[PDB]
């Protein structure tokens, strides 16, 4: 809504340096902030821009304070404080409100208290939707699937059958949870389908982005741990297990039966081999080609960055003939010795 | 279907039964999860020592595993293929829809075959022909004059554009789009001019396509997917791609326009394939393959530099980008000697 700066300072456990009576209407970037807006800064290169910023209030640290040109909210972690104040001043609407008449809800489906189902949503038999669950317009929720209290689906999400989703999850549009894993046996060149009758089990507080696909298990389950965040365009194959609080950035491709530990960070467009394990607290940087298991924590990277095209051509051709090069190095390494 | 006696199953599987044929089998399960009434299978002889742990009523295995059985055993030549077959027999996977939903919007000129099911809120356009036993999931769109062959099945929220042809016994997972405009534009002095894409997509018989995959229509002639092709999730198949019979495309592959792929190929996850070229029959490209050039000879092809610890990778990247100067220093050294 709107909030007095002093009351916002209290809710954020911040030290208010300035007029507590100022009314804050919303959060804004330093560049776009006007009167009534609160903003934040983390990088000290913006301290010199503070004179030009027109926010009614700035969230910053103790060492930033002498550079303030406005009311200031002093904290230990401005970025985290930003997250919290943005949640307080959130203008995001809900995917749905009440039960839309156009929604097609099977007679056996069970609803908790204060459930909202959007227009033209389709809810199959045996489904269970917990308290405060919101199902956006155009959604499909398959047979016997179960969605924990406080979880929300935006428009046009597809949940297959026998899927379990924990509490307070959020899934953006276009995402498909529980499609058949890519299971085929080869019979003299013909692919014979292996029905995928495992499930997907998603923990509590999982956030999944848009157009992401998470396949059901072949026999046992694909498992997404508590507090996992997954961005857009990701592929999570059958029987992947993801540990708690792991982050998966956009466009990551995971092969089947990959196990990822807790507190990992998997960078955008990484491609990860299957039937292996990645241990806890591993970071893979963007476009990582993850061929081998990772047993030790730390940051791992791959890939050769961009060059001007004419340069790249030589780099490529030489890398490709690197064997003939190593050989020549050895011959010469012997003549001298 | 629901239950089956072991001897009857063994007969259908053309398996040699060792143990009690009267045993009631209710489903397939993994070795670690199998309990009474479940059948499982074993391929790797390492699991022999774990058969005591396994609680299945029956295990599918080879003749040589038999002296290690800790249960009734079904003896066959290819346990993995037998598993595919028995999983089909005992499949619990529901159908995308049953009967014609009242909320489906179906044009009067659409031709429906016998025993067609159409799910809630699906939209069928004019001129559409649905073959016998076709099943259209909830919220699908099937565009004008499209044809879907007998026994073909679409899960929820699949989009089929106009003038698309899908053969018999195909299966398409949710979120997939078949027949969107190819990426056709002419450049008029820096401005992009749209080229209407008036070709089609022709999909053969027994084609399985994953979730959130896009297969664009051709510009003039057609995009063609041969019989028995399998395509995983998040794939991009550009206008006028031709894919030969029985080819496998793993998740997240990007194909550019006018690529022709032969029969019995295997394209690994997140490979990126150049267009206006050909890949002959029986080619395998491994994951993340950068397919720049034509491939005229069968065999396995690969690219990419695997992960290294970040500190190590920095050096590798910096040295490779500088490989022309390493190649220079070596020619001069070779001169001296």
């Amino acid at each position: 809504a709107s909030i007095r700066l002093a009351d916002l300072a209290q809710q954020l456990d911040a030290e208010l340096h300035g007029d507590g009576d100022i009314v804050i209407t919303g959060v804004a970037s330093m560049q776009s902030a006007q009167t009534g807006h609160i903003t934040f800064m983390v990088n000290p290169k913006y301290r010199e821009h503070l004179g030009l910023c027109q926010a009614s209030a700035v969230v910053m640290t103790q060492d930033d304070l002498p550079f303030a040109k406005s009311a200031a909210l002093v904290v230990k972690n401005p970025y985290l404080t930003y997250a919290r104040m943005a949640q307080i001043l959130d203008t995001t609407p809900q995917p749905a409100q009440n039960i839309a008449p156009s929604a097609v809800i099977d007679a056996t489906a069970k609803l908790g208290n204060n459930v909202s189902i959007g227009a033209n949503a389709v809810i199959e038999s045996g489904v269970e939707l917990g308290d405060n669950v919101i199902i956006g317009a155009g959604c499909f929720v398959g047979k016997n699937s179960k969605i924990g209290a406080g979880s929300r689906l935006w428009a046009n999400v597809t949940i297959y059958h026998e899927i379990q989703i924990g509490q307070n999850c959020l899934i953006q549009s276009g995402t498909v949870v529980g499609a058949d894993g890519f299971g085929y046996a080869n019979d003299r060149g013909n692919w014979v389908k292996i029905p995928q009758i495992g499930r997907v089990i998603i923990g509590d507080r999982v956030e999944i982005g848009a157009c992401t696909t998470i396949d059901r298990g072949a026999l046992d389950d694909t498992i997404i741990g508590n507090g996992v965040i997954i961005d857009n365009q990701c592929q999570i194959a059958h029987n992947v297990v993801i540990g708690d609080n792991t982050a998966v950035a956009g466009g990551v491709i995971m092969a089947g039966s990959l196990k990822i530990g807790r507190y990992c960070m998997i960078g955008g467009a990484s491609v990860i081999n299957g039937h292996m394990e990645i241990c806890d607290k591993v970071t893979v940087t963007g476009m990582g080609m993850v061929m081998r298991p990772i047993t030790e924590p730390g940051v791992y990277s791959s890939g050769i960055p961009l060059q001007p095209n004419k340069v790249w051509r030589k780099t490529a051709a030489l890398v490709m003939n690197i064997d003939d090069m190593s050989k020549r190095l050895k011959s010469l390494e012997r003549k001298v010795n | 279907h629901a239950s089956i006696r072991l001897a009857d199953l063994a007969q259908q599987l053309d398996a040699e039964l060792h143990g009690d044929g009267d045993i009631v089998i209710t489903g397939v399960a993994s070795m670690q999860s199998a309990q009474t009434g479940h059948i499982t299978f074993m391929v790797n002889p390492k699991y022999r020592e774990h058969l005591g742990l396994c609680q299945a009523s029956a295990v599918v295995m080879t003749q040589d595993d038999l002296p290690f059985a800790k249960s009734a055993a079904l003896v066959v030549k290819n346990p993995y293929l037998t598993y595919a077959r028995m999983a089909q027999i005992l499949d619990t996977t529901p159908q995308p829809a049953q009967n014609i939903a009242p909320s489906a919007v179906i044009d009067a000129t659409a031709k429906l075959g016998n025993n067609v099911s159409i799910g809630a809120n699906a939209v069928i356009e004019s001129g559409v022909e649905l073959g016998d036993n076709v099943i259209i999931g909830a919220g699908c769109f099937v565009g004008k004059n499209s044809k879907i062959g007998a026994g073909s099945r679409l899960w929820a929220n699949v989009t089929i554009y106009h003038e698309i042809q899908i053969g018999q016994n195909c299966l398409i997972q949710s979120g997939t789009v078949v027949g969107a405009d190819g990426f056709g534009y002419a450049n008029d002095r820096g401005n992009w001019v749209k080229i209407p894409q008036i070709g089609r997509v022709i999909i053969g018989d027994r084609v399985e396509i994953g979730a959130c995959t896009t297969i664009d229509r051709g510009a003039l002639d057609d995009t063609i997917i041969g019989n028995g092709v399998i395509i995983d999730n998040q794939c991009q198949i550009a206008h006028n791609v031709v894919i030969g019979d029985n080819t496998a495309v793993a998740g997240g592959v990007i194909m550019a326009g006018s690529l022709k792929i032969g029969r019995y190929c295997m394209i690994g996850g997140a490979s990126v394939i150049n267009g206006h070229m050909e890949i002959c029959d029986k080619v395998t490209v491994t994951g993340m393959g950068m397919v720049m050039r034509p491939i005229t000879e069968p065999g396995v092809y690969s690219s990419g530099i695997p992960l290294q610890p970040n500190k190590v990778w920095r050096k590798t990247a910096a040295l490779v980008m500088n490989i022309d100067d390493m190649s220079k220093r070596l020619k001069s050294l070779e001169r001296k000697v």
């Binding site: 095209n309 051509r313 030589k314 051709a317 | 720049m292 050039r293």
Partner: peptide, 10 residues
Amino acid sequence: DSLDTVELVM
């Protein structure tokens, strides 16, 4: 192609 001349010249 893009790489063909460099390879030859090599």
